[PDB]
Amino acid sequence: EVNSFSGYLKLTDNVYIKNADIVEEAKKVKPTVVVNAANVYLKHGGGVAGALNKATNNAMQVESDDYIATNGPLKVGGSCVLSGHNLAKHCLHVVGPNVNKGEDIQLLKSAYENFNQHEVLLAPLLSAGIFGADPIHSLRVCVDTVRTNVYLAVFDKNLYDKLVSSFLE
Ligand SMILES: CNC(=O)c1cccc(-c2cc3c(N[C@H](c4ccc5c(c4)S(=O)(=O)CCC5)C(C)C)ncnc3[nH]2)c1
Numbered sequence: 824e825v826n827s828f829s830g831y832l833k834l835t836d837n838v839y840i841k842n843a844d845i846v847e848e849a850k851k852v853k854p855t856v857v858v859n860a861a862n863v864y865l866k867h868g869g870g871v872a873g874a875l876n877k878a879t880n881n882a883m884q885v886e887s888d889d890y891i892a893t894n895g896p897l898k899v900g901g902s903c904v905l906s907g908h909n910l911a912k913h914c915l916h917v918v919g920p921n922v923n924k925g926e927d928i929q930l931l932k933s934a935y936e937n938f939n940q941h942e943v944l945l946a947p948l949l950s951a952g953i954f955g956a957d958p959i960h961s962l963r964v965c966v967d968t969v970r971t972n973v974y975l976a977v978f979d980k981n982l983y984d985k986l987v988s989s990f991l992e
Contacts, residue, residue: 826854826943828974834990837972838965842983845871845947845976846878849910854974857911858938858946859883860954861918863896865903871947879908887916899926900933915941923955931956935968943972948986951977958982959989966990 828848831839841848849857860871865887867876876883886905897903902917919934920926934949949965950956958977965973977983 827852828854828945831974832987834987835966837970838975839973840962840975840977840983840986842978842980843976844874844978845945846874846910848945848974848976849875849907850878852945854907854911854943854945856913856915856941856944857907858944858949859914859916860947860949861897861902861916862921863899863918865891865897865916870952875910875914878910882906882908883914900930902934902937911945913941915944917949919950919954919956919961921954922950923953928956928960931961931964932968935965938969938973939971941971943974945974945976948975948977951982958986962986962990 831841897918907914917937920930948961951958
């Protein structure tokens with residue numbers, strides 16, 4: 824079966840959310856697109872990006888280095904489409920701003936706008952965790968910006984509960 828997402832909670836007509844590890848979701852669903860929470864040189868050194876790359880046994884990193892060699896780095900707020908390897912048909916590498924490193928939070932809207940080029944996506948909550956954005960704010964930007972069908976996997980039950988309670992106020 825195609826894009827067989829299970830156990831999500833529908834927030835809006837096109838945004839769904841689950842307490843889950845995006846890696847485990849990608850292995851089980853094999854979505855058309857999985858979003859990586861990338862940086863501009865596509866160096867998948869830790870967190871979500873490191874986990875997705877490890878699940879490909881480093882194939883994603885080798886492919887990413889080849890892309891950067893030919894094309895140069897991405898911009899903050901930008902994206903590129905590469906192979907999804909064993910995780911998906913395609914991986915959409917999206918660079919959200921890292922506000923812990925001084926990048927402008929306004930670029931989070933630009934980052935989510937990249938999702939609109941794909942009908943269905945499995946994605947993490949952009950710029951959350953160690954990128955330093957307020958995760959409640961990131962969910963609001965996602966809801967207001969994404970118009971295609973997005974399935975958010977958030978790997979922390981405490982944060983999941985806080986996000987759902989915020990959405991339902
Ligand atoms: C097999 N699994 C692993 O090897 C593994 C190991 C180690 C980690 C994971 C893993 C983490 C994680 C996740 N974290 C969220 C999150 C969202 C966005 C960003 C980050 C973190 S960041 O990496 O800190 C910076 C980039 C933006 C947290 C809860 C807010 N959300 C979904 N799926 C996840 N998976 C799997």
